[PDB]
Structure 1
Amino acid sequence: MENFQKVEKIGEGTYGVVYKARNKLTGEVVALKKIRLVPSTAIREISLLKELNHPNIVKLLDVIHTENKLYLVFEFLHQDLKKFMDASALTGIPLPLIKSYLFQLLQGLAFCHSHRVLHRDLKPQNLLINTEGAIKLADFGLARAFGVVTLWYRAPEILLGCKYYSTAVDIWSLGCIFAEMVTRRALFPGDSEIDQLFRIFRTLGTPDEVVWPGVTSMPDYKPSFPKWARQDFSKVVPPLDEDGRSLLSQMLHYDPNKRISAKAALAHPFFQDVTKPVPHLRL
């Protein structure tokens, strides 16, 4: 760690504090994450993530295991989607830019999912943007490598106690983020696990055996859950057009098996006119 000069704290992530730092020998500017606790399985799993490169994935440059402490060295980007959405709150992110960002994030998910790597904790704070119009997902695979607080983007199967969740959890989180970019407000801002679950039910309807076979047998499912009627997406994400609402509805299906995959979502008619605009970034 003597090879790195810390510039400033970037933030406090799920698995540790992130710092902007300079590599003293190469002059490289990086993001350094100090993992808060090292287990041998975690080292091997993290080491496999170093081989996982894609233009829409934040590069894991190095794993440093020293003095019983673990540091992850990553590619640095200048802004996260949270700060960008806050800066764009008065005017809204232009629809062509939301579409480009959604398309790129789906390419990133499709890539990780093809390698059986899941994120599990997607949120605006771990989506990073640059001046070229790119957006990249940070922290893929860390949840599985380390094991085990914003609940807003959590898939209903996780909230209902499914232990063996799938790649569909990331599609759910990304659907939530897509809605938030469009409306400029969080879709499901729950402040407890039950409030998160009930906010989902009040919008999409309380799930039942018809829409989600096996739901009633889930570990945390209670027959005493109130039964709310589903709402129209036209009320949920105005002024998003029919193509966007159709795609979003597929990303927010209750049954993880019915939920659209990243690969199938890339083929959705919503992306027929996708482009790559340049955002106005104030750094």
Structure 2
Amino acid sequence: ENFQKVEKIGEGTYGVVYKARNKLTGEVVALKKIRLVPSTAIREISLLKELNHPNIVKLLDVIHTELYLVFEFLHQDLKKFMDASALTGIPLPLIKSYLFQLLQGLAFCHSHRVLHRDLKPQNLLINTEGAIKLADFGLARAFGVTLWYRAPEILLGCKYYSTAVDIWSLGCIFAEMVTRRALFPGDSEIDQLFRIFRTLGTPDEVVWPGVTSMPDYKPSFPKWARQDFSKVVPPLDEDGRSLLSQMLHYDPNKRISAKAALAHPFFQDVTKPVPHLRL
């Protein structure tokens, strides 16, 4: 009744997303219809209405009548942009700008103990003004599949994972912007873990204390040597490779925080370019 659906723009784990217009006000929004409401989800989603930041997609309204989530609408995601930019690549100053802004978004959310848990290029939304924003923060915790961006602690069965899972995912996305190919495109959970291990080396107690005690760890995992890191994201410079290395540390406690990543020398020359978007 209150929204005219314009077109289907996405499908998440929790429901279909439509571009829609408010019939009273004329505001254009993204309207997510949540699939099959538990009272704890209502309370958790209501708290996310408060979590406002320029690099977080705004949750405008929660409508529990007879659950719909009304979000800010952006015109493109980073997957479509990367695919449009595949001949030439995204220029490094724009990659750097986007990574910086996404680390600002993560630093804000993490400072409020809110995790994303499922970052992927389709969750990263851009506009014509050079902004990039994170979509879906806090929904995984509120409500309770691409594996390519999943942290190794998740894949090894850790129940009580941390803000570090989002840094991992963002490092994977960073690498993909630079190289124009997904870093770890696994098509099952074991294929995902084995692709990580084939690049970064099979983890052991030296690099990741406690790893051999993790729920899904098996002593029978093959033991791959770690690849030379300059083979992973050529031709990214040593500042970018250093930052990526720190985002992809196995040990979640060693992995760089969003806040510390913002201070990395890679961002010494950061700027805010505007992308040419074809809408």
**When the two structures are superposed, what TM-score results if normalisation uses the length of structure 2?**
1.00
How far off its partner does 1:15 sit?
1.1
What displacement does 1:93 show? 0.2
In the alignment, the residues of structure 2 paired with residue 218 and residue 170 of structure 1 have an alpha-carbon distance, to the nearest angstrom, of: 20
- 3-state DSSP class of the match of 1:30? strand
Residue 51 of structure 1 aligns with which residue?
Answer: 50
In structure 2, C-alpha distance between the alignment counterparts of 1:18 and 1:89, rounded to whole Å: 26
Aligned residue-pair number: 279
Distance 2:51 2:232 in 1: 36
Q: Deviations over 1:89-133 (max 9, x none)?
A: 111000000000000000000000000000000000000000000
Shift of 1:232: 1.7
Output one character per residue of 1:158-216: Cα deviation in whole Å (capped at 9) or x when no partner.
00000000000000000000000000000000000000000000000000000000000
How far residue 259 of structure 1 moved from its aligned partner, in angstroms, is 0.2
Unaligned regions of 5+ residues in structure 2, if any?
none
Q: State the distance in 2 between where 1:204 and 1:233 align.
A: 8
Where structure 1 has 5 or more consecutive residues not aligned to the other structure, the ranges are none
Higher mean alpha-carbon deviation, 10-19 vs 179-188, is at: 10-19
Deviations 1:230-251 (A, max 9, x none): 0122100000000000000000
Q: Aligned partners of 1:199, 1:155: CA distance in 2, in Å? A: 12
User: Which 4+ runs in 1 deviate beyond 6 A?
Assistant: none
- Summarize the alignment of residues 1-283 of structure 1 with structure 2, pairs less than 5 Å apart: 2-67=1-66, 70-147=67-144, 149-283=145-279
- Mapped partners of 1:14, 1:113: distance in 2: 22
In 2: Cα distance, 1:96 partner to 1:258 partner: 27
**In the TM superposition, what is the alpha-carbon distance from 1:37 to its structure 2 partner?**
2.2
Provide the secondary structure at the position in 2 that maps to 1:46. Answer: helix
- How much does 1:220 deviate? 0.1
Deviations 1:69-105 (A, max 9, x none): x110000000000000000011100000000000000
Query: How far apart are the structure 2 equivalents of 1:56 and 1:123?
Result: 15
Q: What root-mean-square deviation, in Å, do the aligned CA atoms of Structure 1 and Structure 2 show?
A: 0.4
Higher alpha-carbon deviation: 187-196 or 31-40: 31-40
The SS at the match of 1:61 is strand
For residue 17 of structure 1, give the secondary structure of its aligned residue in structure 2.
strand
Post-superposition offset of 1:66:
1.6
Q: How far apart, in 1, do the equivalents of 2:158 and 2:230 lie?
A: 30
Cα distance in 2 for residues equivalent to 1:44 and 1:228:
45
Deviation at residue 32 of structure 1 after TM alignment: 0.3
**Identity of paired residues, percent?**
100
Where 1:151 maps in the other structure, the secondary structure is coil
CA distance in 2, matches of 1:199, 1:66: 45
Could you tell me how far 1:270 is from its partner in structure 2? 0.1
CA distance in 2, matches of 1:167, 1:46: 19
Query: Secondary structure in 1 aligned to 2:158?
Result: coil
SS in 2 for 1:5: strand
